[model samples]
Target: KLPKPFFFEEGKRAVLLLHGFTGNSSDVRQLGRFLQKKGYTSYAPQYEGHAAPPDEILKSSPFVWFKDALDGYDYLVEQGYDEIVVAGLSLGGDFALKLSLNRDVKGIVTMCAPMGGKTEGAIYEGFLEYARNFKKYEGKDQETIDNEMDHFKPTETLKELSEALDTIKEQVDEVLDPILVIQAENDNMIDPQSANYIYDHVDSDDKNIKWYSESGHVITIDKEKEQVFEDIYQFLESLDWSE
Candidate 1:
């Protein structure tokens, strides 16, 4: 089992750290700790039905994960955090951008976020592969696995997720909050053009993009993550936290 959601309370300013698809809060645990040590509180929430079996993941959708992200933000608000920064990796990055449009977030940091890239089909296929491997790991026979796979008709979920990203891409010009986009040169899942699109389309007066080499989709936990942490710290520090 994966570690449960974590809240590291260290300062007045807070951070809502979100993990990628099929990943739990553990994906952002180290980043939370790094920010906490830098005098900032950080809360990482596990999406609904995650950290469980593949079937459970299919039961949840992007909508549910977005709701969980909102709840995590509310939890910080309830804790008396007035200024907050939202940062996420991969799918979490998509929600971070989506959240900024709805909330008065101080800033946003997206790591390997998907924009209008051709990742929709790839993501669905990856989910199926993950499920297949999970079933194999459970010692399910080929026939049972086939039966289970037949029942996993998750095209709707994929469609909705694609629509969400497209909406975000279309509304990127309305995103006025300061943003820092991070991309990995070696990332193989989403197109590198997505990063450039985000940087080019966002209306934020204060925005920047950084490219990290030797890293993959989950840049938060990949090689050069320490540098990633430092870069995020610098961006957070640059934001105006005027109350």
Candidate 2:
């Protein structure tokens, strides 16, 4: 497990941010800073197999990552943040959605989450083809190559990925809390339709989907990060806690 980086004072409203696969807390550090500026506490936890050697991550399962996120949520509760919002990117988004279903989250946000079946279309096909035919270099002093090789390690088979998706979809509708689904039009990893599907299928009284035409999979780190932050703040402000 990786250490969580927290900002702001105790007793403030908390927002727990989770990063995507192969990413660390640094991926969402900018959002944490933005939240701090807005007088909100932010908790960004680095999941298992992250910020470590690739071999370590390669041997880990998605279940471990989800457990790490739940642990982060429990940490926030222990720190006295009862009213909390959970948000994440990519696979982290899936974990966030899972938490929202089971926990009492005030709000939820997911960016470029993978809900669709698989990568398709000409662009991704060409990229995968190129990757498949890329030269294989195994030598010393190749620091970048050596470092990235771990990320390339295959942890899940196609069957495992399919099973995980089915499980998420089956359980996602139980999350009755308000949700914010943000999708990038040019996202290469997950289909944009997944956001639409989430909006139509999620059982929430208040849900909104924001589409970014100019962004990619990394909308939180992209040029439209300000828009993302604004949307999240608006969602946080709109939550009704007087039940």
Candidate 3:
């Protein structure tokens, strides 16, 4: 549990931010701090097992992380933040989408969310290969590859990820609120085409997709971070919060 109280100031519009797998709340702290400067209260909960060692996280299921997200949402509600916006990165994006579907979220943003399974020629297989073999080779000088290997260490097995992907897809249509999707076109971890799949299948009419050509999977910390934040803030501003 967090040492400090989950709630901040009362009656302030809240933004619940979630980080990707193998990542802690600090992953999204840049954006959270930006929101704070903009006069919006933001909370990024440290998901279960995230603050722990890699071995502990490897033993955790995606459902456990989802539970932590729900707990954070409940905390926001208890603090009188009935009007809330939820945003997340990667696996955190999946959790944010689920929350938007089930809770009374005012807006939702998903950064590099995966929407499809590992079919042949899909990006999922490429990521899996990179994860499985990148450590074996040492000659590549690609900055993108090096950066991905540095930031992401996939502790969950392929089987677990496959199962989670299917589960997230099964519930995609249930998300009825407006959604803003920010995807890096050059993302190696998730297929950029998944953004189109999400845009096509989402039940909301108020959906927007923004592509960042220069960035990779970790858009929150990538070269296009400021642009991503601006787009998200604009999306939330366009929402009818009084409804």
Candidate order by TM-score, decreasing, is: 1, 2, 3
Q: Which candidate's TM-score is highest?
A: 1
lDDT of 3 by residue, 1-243 (tens): 322223334237788988876567767877876677666778788776655544355467777778889889888878677789998898888888888877888888999988754533444455445453543354455775556566654535445766777788888888888999889999887778888877778898799999999998889988889988888878877877763
Q: Alpha-carbon error at 67 in model 3, in Å?
A: 0.6
TM-score, every prediction: 0.91, 0.83, 0.80
User: Which candidate number would show the highest lDDT if scored against the true structure?
Assistant: 1
C-alpha local distance difference test of each model: 0.86, 0.74, 0.75
- lDDT measured at residue 10 in model 3 versus the true structure, 0 to 100: 29
193 Cα displacement, candidate 3 (Å)? 0.6
Error of 2 at 225 (Å): 0.3
Cα-based RMSD of the predictions, in order? 2.0, 4.7, 6.4
The local distance difference test score of model 1 is 0.86
Residue lDDT tens for model 1, 136-217: 8788999999999999886766777777778777877788899999999877788877889888888899998999988988
**Model 3 residue 35 distance off true place after TM-score fit, in angstroms:** 1.1
